[PDB]
Amino acid sequence: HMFELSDVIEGKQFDREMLSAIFDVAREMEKIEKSSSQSEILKGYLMATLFYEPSTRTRLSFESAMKRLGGEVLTTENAREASSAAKGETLEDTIRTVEGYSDIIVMRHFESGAARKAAATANIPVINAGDGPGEHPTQALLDVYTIQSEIGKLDGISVALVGDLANGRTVRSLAYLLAKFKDVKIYFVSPEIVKMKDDIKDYLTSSGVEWEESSDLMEVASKCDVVYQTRIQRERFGERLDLYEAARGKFIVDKDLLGVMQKKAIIMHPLPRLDEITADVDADPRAAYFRQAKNGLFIRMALLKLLLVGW
Amino acid sequence: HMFELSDVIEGKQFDREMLSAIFDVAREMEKIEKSSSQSEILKGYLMATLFYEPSTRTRLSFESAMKRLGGEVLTTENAREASSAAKGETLEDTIRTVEGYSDIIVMRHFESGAARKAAATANIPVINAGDGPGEHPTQALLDVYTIQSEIGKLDGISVALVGDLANGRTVRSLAYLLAKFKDVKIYFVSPEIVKMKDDIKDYLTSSGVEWEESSDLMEVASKCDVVYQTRIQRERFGERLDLYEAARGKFIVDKDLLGVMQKKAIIMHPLPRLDEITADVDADPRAAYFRQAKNGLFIRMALLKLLLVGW
Amino acid sequence: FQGPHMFELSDVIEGKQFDREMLSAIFDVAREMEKIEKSSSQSEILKGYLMATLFYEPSTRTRLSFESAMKRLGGEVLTTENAREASSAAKGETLEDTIRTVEGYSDIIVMRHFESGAARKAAATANIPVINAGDGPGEHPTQALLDVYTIQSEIGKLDGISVALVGDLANGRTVRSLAYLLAKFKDVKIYFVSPEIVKMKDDIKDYLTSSGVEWEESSDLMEVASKCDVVYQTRIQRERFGERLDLYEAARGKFIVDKDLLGVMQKKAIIMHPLPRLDEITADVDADPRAAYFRQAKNGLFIRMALLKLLLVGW
Ligand SMILES: O=C(O)C[C@H](NC(=O)CP(=O)(O)O)C(=O)O
Ligand SMILES: O=C(O)C[C@H](NC(=O)CP(=O)(O)O)C(=O)O
Ligand SMILES: O=C(O)C[C@H](NC(=O)CP(=O)(O)O)C(=O)O
């Protein structure tokens, strides 16, 4: 029974029914991962990774997921310097040739739109591991799985998206997924120079999702189930380091912020964090960003299985 | 029965009978690669890769070949920065060390002659994945396999070698292999500054192989079974990027060139290409460079099997 | 059916963690691993386990020997060959956050870092075993383990021997950890032979004096070498000199292992070097049977197989 997606590129590809089904597979993958026996579901399949930007979680969780299911991995951990991209090769030619050696490609690129172009080129599945400041659909998938796992529900919740929303490929993809549930309220909390872009706002409005911008993080956090913090995306600011430092340091998750949050609310962060979540938050049971990262293993196991061998 | 070569370093090591037999094995490997069952021919064997220059096809095709045969791989994707070559270690000490962890070494180096020095140090097989602007024997092997596969014949054909011939480790090795067949005519088409070096010319003349220099690519291409285009090798020009740019734009494979070529002729390119084959050409069935790269998987599977377990 | 018997260490971070009886037992395991590595059968001892490597400094032997060891035992590896450029350390992530995240994907972490003390911090953060593959100029405990194994294998003993530690002692994380392990045996005499600017640091000297280990500084390598069982040469640690290249160059060329040095050494003595070498062991020496540094490097495979097995599945 074939998986309905040929590639995982954009958050809009997912409907509510598909998300619930993927979450069920991820819970089964958690059982496999905990098990003593080595799974062979993906024995014989090869994944090629192509990372043109740095990564710890997304690269290693995809590789670990593949190996835990019995598959193998062909890595390119720095494609800008060590692949023939360094000789001038286009992404499209890279994808065309790498598909000759592999069964699925995981690619992170520095240009928005790169993953869509890769999927159009390739006749094997492509997974977008982040395309510039564009999208990050598997982050969004594991984020919603984490919320459902931590809060117990997705309908009716209030979610604060905090920090660099303009450049945040994570919060952009997450916004698309949250719009598939009902009675979700989203607060945008950011410096004005990195407010959420109009393509997301217009999509949410067209989808009848209530959203509000606010600069009062303590007030917003007091009434949210989820506070989703982000890193200010320095690599997207070019030479405008004045604007980078202007956007930094203005919205911090600290012990005082936790003190106004409900007992059953959570803090999330796709990671890495710099200064925007203080270290003393980590000890709070509501600090969910390391459980969130761990959950990416099971979500990516589920996606690799579904794309390669189906439901 | 053991393979007659202990290392794969230079095109001159091959003879016609050996080439034919390797191609026969590559065709069997294509059946293995297609099959549903994961092969175990090389279970228990370990390949070490040592890439001191960038690579996409050569590095990933060797790793994929090894894993498709059931073996494993110890990768060094950027030996200059991430291996103890960065501390000043010689190539010979690197090779002597790495053989303690592995059964076969695949090395791409920036100095011509490096692969022969590695083979002389090692007591396990070494494969030259490119040694500066010197040679690239497995590229030449897959190139001749591709010509036989596409054209149906090697004896009697006409082959144009186009582009940066002086620095082209690909065309240098290919010339050595073409010399092993009967009545091959080779055309050299290049800017004067990157014409084929005298060592190749003298070898061909001494071996009775007809070659001809021409600056009229349209005329040459109308007469050839194979037009083999190359990238101008920017990394060999040092800081003389003025002479590099001056050598570009003079010999382009475009739809106009395809328009004068015979119906049964092909375009080849070891890749990557920049501007020297236009995107239009890819849609012509005669554009063989992506099939060529795919064939490298099967040829490299054949070589690994032969070097490690024999016939 | 009583289950595993856990190794007494939870992490391999510092040479002082080892005791004499544990070292002897580890060496026995390494000899068993040599039989496994040589066998035509693929071992499955570590089937299903994953090692994450995190290399923030260059490596050939340490990185590849750990990966080869893991695979020869049937385990798998998640590599980060250049963590500074290709991991989210490049975005500014702390070591502690990196370790906490990477343990979610793996069962053991092998880390080489540029700061002394990094491995201690990683072990404190992680709830899976961490192995220190080198923490700045601090320590290199698995080099020291394979070094002592090599001495036992080549010389036949560790008690009573004389060992010359030669070269850059100040910055040598290898000789620093080796000194801690040599102190666990009886009547070992240690000679320090170095340029003054890279003499052995006081923390090691004070530890040896407190442990009753006789040590002596000398500038006469021919004299020292003639009365030692082991001459352990090192590379002058260029990267630790940073911009002070004039001091680096002046520390070179003073203490060379060459054919003349071998000529004054005993028949049964050996030359060791954790590698890489530059000029400080001449090529001539490689042909002498006493030149042990490539056997030493090979022995690292067996010692690291032993450590991975012990830390993941026990005795
Ligand atoms: O980098 C961020 O701040 C968020 C996000 N982070 C990740 O995906 C985690 P990693 O970079 O470790 O794979 C990204 O967009 O890459
Ligand atoms: O680089 C070229 O232009 C031709 C040739 N290309 C290859 O081998 C393919 P790759 O660099 O992707 O491994 C080379 O000499 O490396
Ligand atoms: O670098 C040296 O001179 C000694 C020592 N060398 C090693 O561990 C071997 P490698 O760097 O190849 O892993 C080190 O401290 O890293």
Distance, CA of B21 to CA of B28 (rounded, Å): 11
CA–centroid distance, C112 to ligand 1, in Å, is: 23
Distance, CA of C290 to CA of C265 (rounded, Å): 10
Where do the DSSP E strands lie in B76-225? 104-109, 126-131, 158-162, 185-189, 210-213
Distance, CA of A162 to CA of A196 (rounded, Å): 10
Give the right CATH number for C141-297 from 3.40.50.1370, 3.40.718.10, 3.40.50.300, 3.30.413.10: 3.40.50.1370
The alpha carbon of residue C260 and the mean position of all alpha carbons in its chain are separated, in whole angstroms, by 28
- Give the CA dihedral C32, C33, C37, C43, nearest 10 degrees: 100
Pick the catalytic residue: A1, A31, A34, A87? Answer: A87
Neighbours of chain B (3+ CB pairs under 8 A): A, C
Q: Per the structure block, which two tokens stand in for C228?
A: 């030692």
Percent composition of chain A: helix, strand, coil (DSSP 3-state, to 5) = 45, 15, 40
Query: Which value, in Å, is the radius of gyration of the alpha carbons in chain C?
Result: 19
- A68-92 per-residue burial string, b: 16 or more CB within 10 A, e: under 16: bbebbbbbbbbbbbbbbbbbebebb
Q: Does A41 touch chain B (CB under 8 A)?
A: no
Mutation probe of ligand 3 site: the residue of C174, C234, C281, C303 with most atoms within 8 A of C-beta: C174
Q: Does C146 touch chain B (CB under 8 A)?
A: no
Distance, CA of A301 to CA of C105 (rounded, Å): 12
| Catalytic site includes residue B234 | no
Method underlying the structure = X-ray
Q: Report in angstroms the alpha-carbon separations of C36 from A75, C149, C190, C301.
A: 28, 17, 35, 11
Q: Do A56 and C104 touch (CB under 8 A)?
A: no
The total of other beta-carbon atoms located within 10 Å of residue B35's CB is: 11
Q: Is the CB of B88 under 6 A from ligand 3?
A: no
- Using the structure block, give the residue that is written with the tokens 């285009």: B229
The span from the first CA to the last CA of chain C, in angstroms, equals 14
Walk across the sheet containing B126-131 and list its strands: B72-74, B46-51, B104-109, B126-131
Q: Does A37 touch chain C (CB under 8 A)?
A: yes
Q: Per the structure block, which two tokens stand in for B152?
A: 């149906």
Of A97, A103, A105, A124, which to mutate for an interface test with B (greatest number of B Cβ within 10 Å)? Answer: A97
Residues 6+ apart with CB under 8 A from C267: none
Mutation probe of ligand 1 site: the residue of A59, A131, A136 with most atoms within 8 A of C-beta: A136
Which residues does chain C have within 8 Å of residue B97's beta carbon, measured at their own beta carbons?
Answer: 60-61, 275, 294, 297
Give the 3-state secondary structure of residue B175: helix
DSSP labels, A255-269: HHHHHTS-TT-EEE-
- Using the structure block, give the residue that is written with the tokens 């994944």: A47
Q: Per the structure block, which two tokens stand in for C8?
A: 């007494």
Crossing angle of helices A289-309 and A137-151, rounded to 10° = 120
DSSP labels, C214-236: EEEE-S-HHHHHTT-SEEEE---
Q: Do B274 and A77 touch (CB under 8 A)?
A: no
Where does chain A have alpha helices with state H?
16-34, 57-68, 79-82, 91-98, 114-121, 137-151, 169-178, 198-206, 217-222, 241-247, 255-259, 289-309
Q: Does C298 touch chain B (CB under 8 A)?
A: yes
* Ligand with smallest separation from the Cα of A85: 2
Residues 6+ apart with CB under 8 A from A178: A144, A154, A159, A184, A186, A209
Resolution in A: 1.7
What values do phi and psi take at C288, rounded to 5? Answer: -75, 135
Q: Does A78 touch chain C (CB under 8 A)?
A: yes
Distance, CA of C135 to CA of C130 (rounded, Å): 12
Pocket, ligand 1, Cβ cutoff 6 A: A 55-58, 130, 136, 139, 169-170, 231, 270-271; C 88, 91
Give the 3-state secondary structure of residue B297: helix
Where do the DSSP E strands lie in B8-123? 46-51, 72-74, 104-109
Angle at CA of residue C258, ends C257 and C263, nearest 5°:
105
Contact B57, A97 (CB under 8 A): yes
AA letter at A1: H
Element (H, E) at B217: helix B217-222
The total of other beta-carbon atoms located within 10 Å of residue A210's CB is: 12
Query: Which value, in Å, is the radius of gyration of the alpha carbons in chain A?
Result: 19
Candidates A241, A278, A245, A281; CA nearest to A265 is A281
The total of other beta-carbon atoms located within 10 Å of residue B95's CB is: 24
